[PDB]
Amino acid sequence: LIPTVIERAYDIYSRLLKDRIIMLGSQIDDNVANSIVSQLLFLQAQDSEKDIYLYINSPGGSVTAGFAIYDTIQHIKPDVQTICIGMAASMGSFLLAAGAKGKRFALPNAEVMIHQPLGGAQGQATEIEIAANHILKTREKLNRILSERTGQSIEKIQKDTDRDNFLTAEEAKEYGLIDEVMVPE
Amino acid sequence: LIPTVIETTNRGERAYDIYSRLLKDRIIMLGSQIDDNVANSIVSQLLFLQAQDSEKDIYLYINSPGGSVTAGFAIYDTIQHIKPDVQTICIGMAASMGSFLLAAGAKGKRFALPNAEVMIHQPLGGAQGQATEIEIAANHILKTREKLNRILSERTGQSIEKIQKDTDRDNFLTAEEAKEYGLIDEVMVP
Amino acid sequence: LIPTVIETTNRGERAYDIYSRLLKDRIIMLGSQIDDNVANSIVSQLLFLQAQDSEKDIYLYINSPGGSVTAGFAIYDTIQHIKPDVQTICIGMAASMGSFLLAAGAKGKRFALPNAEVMIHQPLGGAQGQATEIEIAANHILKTREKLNRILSERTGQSIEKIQKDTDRDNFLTAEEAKEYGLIDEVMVP
Amino acid sequence: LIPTVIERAYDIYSRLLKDRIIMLGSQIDDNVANSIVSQLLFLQAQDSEKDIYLYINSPGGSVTAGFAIYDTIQHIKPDVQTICIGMAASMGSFLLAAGAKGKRFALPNAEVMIHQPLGGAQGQATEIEIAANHILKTREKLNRILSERTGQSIEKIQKDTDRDNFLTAEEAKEYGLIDEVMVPE
Amino acid sequence: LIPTVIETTNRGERAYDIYSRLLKDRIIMLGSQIDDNVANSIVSQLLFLQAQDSEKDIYLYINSPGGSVTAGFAIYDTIQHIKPDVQTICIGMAASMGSFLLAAGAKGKRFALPNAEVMIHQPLGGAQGQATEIEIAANHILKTREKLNRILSERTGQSIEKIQKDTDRDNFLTAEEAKEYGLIDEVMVPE
Amino acid sequence: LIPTVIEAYDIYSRLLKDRIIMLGSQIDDNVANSIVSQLLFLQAQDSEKDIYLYINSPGGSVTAGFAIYDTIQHIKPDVQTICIGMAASMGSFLLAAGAKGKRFALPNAEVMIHQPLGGAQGQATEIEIAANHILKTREKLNRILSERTGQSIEKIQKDTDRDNFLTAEEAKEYGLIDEVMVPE
Amino acid sequence: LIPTVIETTNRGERAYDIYSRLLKDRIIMLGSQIDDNVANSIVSQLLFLQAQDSEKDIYLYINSPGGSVTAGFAIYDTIQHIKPDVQTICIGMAASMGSFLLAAGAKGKRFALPNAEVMIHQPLGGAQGQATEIEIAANHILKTREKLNRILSERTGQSIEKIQKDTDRDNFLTAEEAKEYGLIDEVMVPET
Amino acid sequence: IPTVIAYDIYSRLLKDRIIMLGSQIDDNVANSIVSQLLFLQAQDSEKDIYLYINSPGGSVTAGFAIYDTIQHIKPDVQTICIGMAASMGSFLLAAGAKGKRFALPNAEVMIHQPLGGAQGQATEIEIAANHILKTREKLNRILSERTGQSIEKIQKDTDRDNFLTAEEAKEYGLIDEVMVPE
Amino acid sequence: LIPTVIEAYDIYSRLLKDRIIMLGSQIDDNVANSIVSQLLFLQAQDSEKDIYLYINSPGGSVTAGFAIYDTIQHIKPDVQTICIGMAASMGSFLLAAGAKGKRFALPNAEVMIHQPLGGAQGQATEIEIAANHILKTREKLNRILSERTGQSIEKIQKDTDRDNFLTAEEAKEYGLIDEVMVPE
Ligand SMILES: CC[C@H](C)[C@H]1C(=O)N(Cc2cccc3ccccc23)C[C@@H]2N(C(=O)NCCCC(F)(F)F)CCC(=O)N12
Ligand SMILES: CC[C@H](C)[C@H]1C(=O)N(Cc2cccc3ccccc23)C[C@@H]2N(C(=O)NCCCC(F)(F)F)CCC(=O)N12
Ligand SMILES: CC[C@H](C)[C@H]1C(=O)N(Cc2cccc3ccccc23)C[C@@H]2N(C(=O)NCCCC(F)(F)F)CCC(=O)N12
Ligand SMILES: CC[C@H](C)[C@H]1C(=O)N(Cc2cccc3ccccc23)C[C@@H]2N(C(=O)NCCCC(F)(F)F)CCC(=O)N12
Ligand SMILES: CC[C@H](C)[C@H]1C(=O)N(Cc2cccc3ccccc23)C[C@@H]2N(C(=O)NCCCC(F)(F)F)CCC(=O)N12
Ligand SMILES: CC[C@H](C)[C@H]1C(=O)N(Cc2cccc3ccccc23)C[C@@H]2N(C(=O)NCCCC(F)(F)F)CCC(=O)N12
Ligand SMILES: CC[C@H](C)[C@H]1C(=O)N(Cc2cccc3ccccc23)C[C@@H]2N(C(=O)NCCCC(F)(F)F)CCC(=O)N12
Ligand SMILES: CC[C@H](C)[C@H]1C(=O)N(Cc2cccc3ccccc23)C[C@@H]2N(C(=O)NCCCC(F)(F)F)CCC(=O)N12
Ligand SMILES: CC[C@H](C)[C@H]1C(=O)N(Cc2cccc3ccccc23)C[C@@H]2N(C(=O)NCCCC(F)(F)F)CCC(=O)N12
Ligand SMILES: [Mg+2]
Ligand SMILES: [Mg+2]
Ligand SMILES: [Mg+2]
Ligand SMILES: [Mg+2]
Ligand SMILES: [Mg+2]
Ligand SMILES: [Mg+2]
Ligand SMILES: [Mg+2]
Ligand SMILES: [Mg+2]
């Protein structure tokens, strides 16, 4: 049950969108990506100069869906701020790190997790090889961009994402995944 | 079936579902298990209410068995970030992350009704796979408990040691006991 | 399929689902098993009706087999907190936490229709795990029963000892027997 | 798919309710009872003197839910006519018999069935005893009211409801469950 | 996996599964939930043993949560019918119809080991359908309870009223408490 | 789920107002019918202005894909194609089907090409019919892909034998798209 | 698939499944979760062994995660009732009621092999229904715990209080730690 | 299972002191193998026993039942890997009498860290984590002793699934020799 | 229902008395353990007389197959292989592993060769380990098949890329068997 606000009637999320706030509040799949991409394109058309605010409370999900959002963020004119509230894990933390430089935030008790991509492969040896080569290339792609966005080496990113790596908001700032911990007003 | 209320309000007539009507008077309902959807909604409502009026109190109704710790912390951090005081009112039950959020309301403005139940306990989780994966999961949930216990100590005035001991198992408190503990400030009487 | 009713005003025809139409005249329907969703809705309706008119009676219709004790206490405490008298009217059945809420209506304004069924019994629950966990769960449900019995004693005029004995097993009462017991004040005749 | 009628757009059932017609067209549960009770209360408030029409096409259902409807019918001022179309069985036929005296009808090919209440009990001997005593008292309550409404003895009602007893509309009139078979006009 | 024991006898070597070996020595194992299969087996063993020797004691081991009342009464009536004394020995647990059968052993020869658990409670059942069917089922289980209580009164020396009250809910007894109650005669102490 | 914008439109309907169609899911008949209807509507609205087909899709039904393909080729306006996230299978086929010079992908978008998938069960002659059908369908797909990319049918056959993942730049090199759309 | 062993006797050639062969030399295998079937079998074997020889030691092998408390007490009481000493030997694991039985072996004849795992914890159970039914179930499991702890105190030399504290949660012990605790007498070291 | 004349084939092999570990290791398998070892010892305390290993591993405690019984008894227990030894299976392969641990040339040996699970309260998860970590240390220490490799190296090499050929297993010290065709 | 013969033997045990082993099912560890035990037993009984391995099998576990393979090569006696019905996958591998000159198939027996099948799930590095493992296993299989057939590793790789069904005569031509056993 999503509440409605009247001032024109808006569901609460649509009301936030009126003030250029986009909610990434779920597992990332193609539906979520298509919606966020559409919202980004709409907000750019509305105003190419004003900041956009991407709220992130997400365990991650599809890498290609994540890259749909990533590429649209980088394509458009306006700065897209990222703010981690609750959790950003996996492709969620990747998108957190993808916000406009100097405008990537987390609230003090927000959790950030980084790890290597997950997948599956079944069938013939050559099919397994193709799937393995694909996920390994995808991992190099992710690591390269994360290196660029954080200032950490690809070597360090590889090592630090080998297993689940949980970071506090302050640790995420130290790592270069965010720029600042947003403290209470 | 959520009922609708219709008001003839000077500039015309407006129809509200009952929860949206409560939101018009700065009342947010945390009335279910805490997951990311619930957290996203409450966070959005908090941000909206601050924008509407940065000074007037917000009222967070809590009837919840708790749920996701990270989802709970989304709500917690948004409460602490915004300018307005967020009152918390426990009606029915606040358990687990629900009682954590009850304790997170503005100092002096945390309430429970007389027969409301408050329960505190340690976080729950799971881990499967390799020994090193189990270790990572264990270290994570232990650090999460320390985080929770530290904040609860700050909010209640109880020591971290006492919080640890009192949350080892399920600990059910009456509204009055929750006040004594420092989880709330007052039992709201008729 | 819930029917819609349309009433013609000067600024248009206002359309109501039948339950929302009843709410316009301060009638709240407790017509299902009591869970947190039902409790949150009823609590919200009570708060809304008080704000709308702090003096006029509210009418709580009860056709319910009961359900969650904490959800029931959410409704109970909200009834006792608000200014207006909340009349209770049992139609069909009030069982368990449903009969508790029937007995919780404003003194002199608790009713049942002549063929309505009222049932009282002890709380139901479950516990699994370690011996100390079972002990905690047992102590909790026993304390919950004491609370329920104490309040029922206050509301009915019966002794706690009698309430304990009469709720040991399922105890079915006619409307007239419920009046004799003190669970209601009057059998509403045609 | 329930059709809409425009004169005020109404779903067909809401349109019938505008002319004081209530549809009991399903198995009787608490939801159905709450709705019918609310409709009865609303119609009384609208006009305390004009007849209400209760359409009955129902296999019956919950006895307590049925008694919610029954007591509300008897409580309110207006006469509630009952009209059996298709079938009235069990608590459905009980409610058919509960309509205003002289205003209980069935169409010629409508089926009326009467039988004893159904239930269940599991657990300890004393629990089974409580459940048995409860359903037996419920049966006595039903039979007593049916006797009053039909003019048949409690003894006869007991015997005739021991097993499933199917009646034609004409037989239901003879029995005293209805007053008239509504013939074509 | 039930182990086998092999003995050299006078007429050759003989192989027994462990339970069949115990039966050779007039020991019957009631070691499971009581259903008709269990009852038929125990009844057959009792009849066989009685034929083997109408005089020598039989030993009924009881580690059972109870079960079917009629199946229990098959065992009960066969015990009472046959000539030999049937000793009863509770090891682990006797609950419900299991404790009834424990109490049904030969007077003076009903035992429990010190940490054995004895539980008594009222019969359990179910009924669904028409009101008159529910009435028949209720009357049946109530009459069955009386029958059980009457016999338990006779075997324990407790009043029917006390039995009724003490079996209203689950009533767990230690071996010593079961002796005090009259369900057994002695707590068998270590030799 | 889907936010509303007021200037009231759901976000996707708002994009459709500016001639943007979203192919953002697995391709089935429902998706195809919707996209076909949108294409026909946009042509009727303006026969000369470009249409923009967003593609984030793992592919799906070949016949549903061909419903979209044929409608694109039938209508007057140029249909630009833009791969964002992923285009796989029939999704990449449709990406390659956009107006010549107006097929794009964003830099980190993934393009995958492979042979059609299917099933057959029953009698030997039924299996033969199903096999002949899917083989003819593959030839149809390969022929069109050859025409659209400039690659030989022989090369297409070889390169689609197994799953073949391409970067946006590789897709441009292959002739599946015309340009990698760089940040503005 | 349980293998068979054949030994040639004087009055013929005799075949045993491997477990039955071990039983011939007074070895009983508690090698599974403890339920009533397992208890009934072990009780029968103990009675049989006692009858066969009231004086020679019996060897109870324990590789078990535990299980039913009442089934465990069937085995426990039979061990204490019979004449012969019952040695206990933990190989692999003894947990819960399994450890309880390990500790119940003849004094001085309770063993574990060096890498065997011993676990102690409080009893587990369930209860559902009316408040008074839950109370009865709670009182029952609590009394059962007290019974277990009292006997464990007697068998180990540890106080009931220490046992209560050390069984509050899962407590894993090495064979050497189990000896130190008093659950066993000796760690059986490899032979010459 | 075929019969030879009467013995089932496995019981016939047991007559010549051959024990088959040919399945996933659970308590039933461990109890059987332990019983066979004890029996063979009683039959002859001096003659070698032959433990065939074609197993994906399984329960660590069940594996240790077999391990401790092997080390307790007098006779040397040869180990022979045929097909596969993985996990606790390779642990037992390495546990055979020194100089008498073998694999056939195409046999596969796999080593990795123990697997497990934990659910419930934070303190319960901590207990479970500490338990599996201790268990890993126990396994690694013994493997170090049996192979001559350092505990540090074992830890590194078992972090993920590590597949070895028979020759590589010999090089590692898990076996002594690759048994070549007669 | 396996019939009994009295001269008492179940039919398969009777065949084993004459040094005939039946590989008549999917290859798993149980099947491998049984066949290994039978091979060891027979050798003990007579180190010089031929053993006959009947193969009617769709294949199965590669490691289980290698248990049988290595035991065949280890023991002294020649192990003849005879394909009746079908030998597929690891089944055809074992058919090819029989004593040189003593590998047979009946005229209508079917022989199928293909690459190994498997699965992998989890982290990228776990998928890599699983991929490297199955690829090394394939190389091992291909190398041995090359040695046993006289075909090049390159040809084996190409011919096992997909399911490759061969007649008994084609299997002889390939070098998987030595002779097609004709009616006597
Ligand atoms: C030159 C601008 C972009 C690059 C170009 C174009 O490539 N696409 C394809 C496209 C489709 C969908 C998502 C995309 C995300 C990133 C990049 C391209 C995307 C649509 C866009 N349009 C708008 O934005 N129109 C303004 C209204 C927008 C609103 F959302 F409000 F409808 C239509 C006019 C047009 O030329 N382009
Ligand atoms: C107080 C947050 C700061 C000032 C900042 C910013 O960080 N975020 C990111 C954000 C996104 C989502 C949830 C957040 C919760 C806590 C903190 C930040 C959150 C959006 C916010 N905006 C509004 O609130 N705009 C007024 C309209 C608000 C309404 F809800 F009504 F739409 C847009 C203008 C802006 O600078 N910020
Ligand atoms: C009468 C003072 C109550 C005690 C106080 C307060 O504690 N709460 C928290 C609360 C939240 C939810 C349910 C509650 C039930 C019982 C008691 C408190 C409850 C909300 C309430 N508000 C209203 O009722 N506003 C009038 C409009 C109400 C309407 F429903 F129409 F929106 C907001 C202003 C306020 O100070 N309080
Ligand atoms: C003297 C009328 C009854 C006795 C009395 C009262 O007891 N109840 C409780 C009640 C609640 C629900 C169902 C009931 C069925 C039968 C009897 C009582 C029922 C509500 C009713 N109300 C209306 O009918 N108001 C007119 C508007 C009604 C409309 F439906 F249109 F909203 C509110 C004013 C009031 O005093 N009472
Ligand atoms: C005391 C039983 C009476 C005298 C009688 C008789 O009623 N029944 C029926 C019967 C059947 C089954 C169970 C019974 C249990 C209790 C009572 C009767 C039962 C069989 C019995 N027989 C034996 O016991 N024969 C000796 C051999 C017995 C052995 F078990 F070893 F086979 C056959 C000769 C005979 O007259 N009766
Ligand atoms: C393309 C037009 C063709 C030649 C012709 C015709 O074949 N079809 C069948 C048809 C049906 C459905 C999808 C189709 C897709 C591609 C081709 C044909 C399709 C309908 C169309 N109409 C419109 O487009 N009318 C303008 C309004 C359109 C709007 F979408 F806005 F409603 C009706 C007048 C008419 O002659 N034709
Ligand atoms: C020490 C047991 C006492 C003396 C006594 C007795 O109480 N029970 C009941 C009983 C039944 C089942 C399990 C029991 C476990 C512990 C204690 C008693 C148990 C049977 C036993 N019998 C034997 O052991 N007979 C020797 C043969 C034994 C063999 F196993 F081989 F068959 C029959 C002769 C007898 O008097 N008693
Ligand atoms: C002094 C030897 C050992 C130390 C001692 C003892 O501790 N156990 C317990 C035990 C039980 C089960 C498995 C065990 C594995 C390893 C170590 C001990 C095990 C049984 C053993 N017995 C035999 O082996 N008897 C010879 C016959 C054996 C045969 F298998 F054939 F039955 C019984 C005589 C006895 O003193 N012991
Ligand atoms: C040629 C294997 C050598 C000589 C050696 C040895 O390594 N193993 C281990 C082993 C175990 C299981 C399967 C094996 C398969 C291939 C190779 C070794 C295998 C057992 C064998 N034995 C026999 O064969 N004994 C004769 C009786 C045989 C019979 F089957 F009939 F029981 C025991 C005496 C012995 O030294 N070895
Ligand atoms: Mg940007
Ligand atoms: Mg605040
Ligand atoms: Mg009030
Ligand atoms: Mg009336
Ligand atoms: Mg007798
Ligand atoms: Mg003893
Ligand atoms: Mg040794
Ligand atoms: Mg050979």
**Residue G149 amino acid letter:** N
Query: Across the interface, which of B6, B92, B188 has its CB nearest the CB of C81?
Result: B188
Distances in Å between the Cα of F180 and the Cα atoms of A80, F94, H169 are 22, 17, 51
- Cα–Cα dist H115/H21, whole Å: 21
Query: Which residues are B118's β-sheet partners?
Result: B94, B173
- Rounded to whole angstroms, how far apart are CA atoms H69 and G112? 11
Distance, CA B22 to ligand 3 centroid (Å)?
8
Distances, alpha carbon E74 to alpha carbons E43, E60, E78, G77, in Å: 7, 14, 6, 29
Q: CA A97, CA A176: separation in Å to the nearest integer?
A: 8
Ligand 9 pocket residue status of I47, Cβ below 6 Å:
no
Burial bucket for residue D2 (CB in 10 Å: 0-12, 13-18, 19+): exposed
Mutate to test the interface with D, among E134, E136, E149 (most CBs of D within 10 A): E134
The CA distance from F136 to C143, in Å, is 76
Ligand index nearest the alpha carbon of residue E77: 5
Q: What is the 3-state secondary structure (H, E, C) of C98-117?
A: HHHHHHCCCCCCEEECCCCE
CATH of D4-181, one of 3.30.70.120, 3.30.1490.20, 3.90.226.10, 3.40.50.300: 3.90.226.10
Reading the block at residue H62, the tokens are: 């069940």
Q: Judge: E63–G74 Cβ closer than 8 Å, yes or no.
A: yes
Ligand at minimal distance from the CA of D51 is 13
Where do the domains of chain A lie? Answer: 4-181
Query: Ligand 9: does its nearest atom lie under 6 Å from the Cβ of I70?
Result: no
Amino acid at B75: I
Query: In angstroms, what is the span from residue A83 Cα to ligand 1's centroid?
Result: 25
Nearest to H104 among I41, I74, I136 (CB): I74
Tokens of B71: 């989802």
Rounded alpha-carbon distances, angstroms, from residue B107 to B47, B80, B87 = 20, 11, 8
Mapped onto helix, strand or coil, the DSSP state of residue C41 is helix
Of the candidates G118, G97, G86, G115, which has an alpha carbon nearest to the alpha carbon of residue G33? G97
- The answer to whether G125 contacts C131, with C-beta atoms less than 8 Å apart, is yes
Q: Which fold has domain I4-180?
A: 2-enoyl-CoA Hydratase; Chain A, domain 1 (3.90.226)
Chain A, chain B: beta-carbon pairs less than 8 Å apart:
99
Beta strand extents in D25-110 (DSSP E only): 52-58, 80-89, 104-106
In terms of Cβ atoms closer than 10 Å to its own Cβ (0-12, 13-18, 19+), residue I135 is middle
**8-state DSSP, G191:** P
Cα distances (angstroms) measured from residue I10 to each of C72, H8, I16, I25: 72, 12, 10, 18
Q: What are phi and psi of E120, to 5 degrees?
A: -120, 140
Which residues on chain I place their C-beta less than 8 Å from a C-beta of chain A? Answer: 114-125, 127-128, 130-132, 134-135, 137-138, 161
E121 catalytic residue (yes or no): yes
Of the listed E20, E32, E64, E121, which one is catalytic?
E121
Phi-psi category of A126—alpha, beta or left, where left has phi over 0 and alpha has psi -120 to 50? alpha
Contact D53, D20 (CB under 8 A): yes
What are φ and ψ of residue D82, in 5° steps?
Answer: -120, 135
Tokens of C95: 């069982």
Q: Which member of I34, I61, I114, I146 is catalytic?
A: I114
Q: Please state whether beta strands H77-86 and H108-111 pair in parallel, antiparallel, or not at all (unpaired).
A: parallel
Q: Are strands I110-113 and I164-166 parallel, antiparallel or unpaired?
A: antiparallel
What residue in A sits closest to I120 (Cα-Cα)? A121
Q: Answer yes or no: CATH 3.90.226.10 is held by domain H3-178.
A: yes
Q: How far is CA D96 from CA C176, D60, D88, D101, in A?
A: 26, 11, 7, 11
Looking at the domain E4-187, which fold is it?
2-enoyl-CoA Hydratase; Chain A, domain 1 (3.90.226)
A35 vs E171: CA distance, rounded Å? 63
Does any ligand 2 atom lie closer than 6 A to the CB of residue A175? Answer: no
State the catalytic residues of H: 87, 112
In angstroms, the CA F86 to CA F105 distance is: 9
Pairing of strands C117-120, C171-173: antiparallel
Q: Which two tokens stand for residue H112?
A: 């990795």
Solving technique: X-ray
- What is the rounded CA–CA span in Å between residue E116 and residue E121? 17
Residues of F in contact with A74 (CB under 8 A): 107, 183
Alpha helices in A11-165 (DSSP H): 12-18, 30-46, 63-75, 91-97, 125-150, 154-160
Q: Residues of A with CB below 8 A from B37's CB? A: 25-26
Measured between alpha carbons, how far is A175 from A168 in angstroms, rounded to an integer? Answer: 10
C-beta atoms surrounding D101 within 10 Å = 8
Across the interface, of A21, A108, A111, the residue whose CB is closest to B70 is: A111
**Length of chain B (residues):** 190
Where helices occur in C28-130 by DSSP H, the ranges are 36-52, 69-81, 97-103
Neighbors of chain A by Cβ distance (3+ pairs < 8 Å): B, F, I
User: Which chain I residues contact residue A127 at CB under 8 A?
Assistant: none
Measuring CA to CA, which residue among F93, F24, B89 is closest to residue C47? Answer: B89
Q: Which two tokens stand for residue F154?
A: 């022989």
HSE-up of residue D121 (Cα within 13 Å, Cβ side): 29
Query: G105 by DSSP, 3-state: which?
Result: coil
Query: Does the beta carbon of A22 sit less than 6 angstroms from any atom of ligand 2?
Result: no
How many Cα neighbours within 13 Å face the side chain of E70?
5
From the list G122, G131, G134, which residue is nearest C132 (CB)?
Answer: G122
At D43, which helix (H) or strand (E)? helix D30-46
- Taking the C-alpha atoms of residue G58 and residue A180, their distance in angstroms, rounded to an integer, is 71
Q: Rounded to an integer, what distance in angstroms lies between the CA atom of residue G67 and that of residue F58?
A: 51
Q: Identify whether the C-beta of residue A80 lies closer than 8 Å to the C-beta of residue A99.
A: yes
- To the nearest whole Å, the CA of B141 is away from the closest chain H CA by 6
Bridge partners of G128?
C126
For residues C62 and C92, what is the distance between their CA atoms, to the nearest angstrom? 8
Q: State whether residue I94 is helix, strand or coil.
A: helix
C-alpha–C-alpha distance, residues G93 and G99, integer Å? 8
Report the 10 Å Cβ neighbour count for E12.
Answer: 9
Which other chains touch chain F, taking contact as 3+ CB pairs less than 8 Å apart? A
Going from the C-alpha of I125 to that of each of A67, A139, A160, the distances in angstroms are 21, 10, 13
Q: How far is the CA of D31 from the centre of ligand 3 (A)?
A: 29
> Active-site residue among I13, I89, I92, I146?
I89
Cβ-defined contact of C128 to G126 (cutoff 8 Å):
yes
Cα(E32)–Cα(G71) distance, integer angstroms: 11
Nearest Cα residue to H165 out of I131, A125, I115, I137: I137
- CB contacts < 8 Å between D and E, how many? 73
Q: What interhelical angle do D125-150 and E131-156 show, nearest 10? A: 150
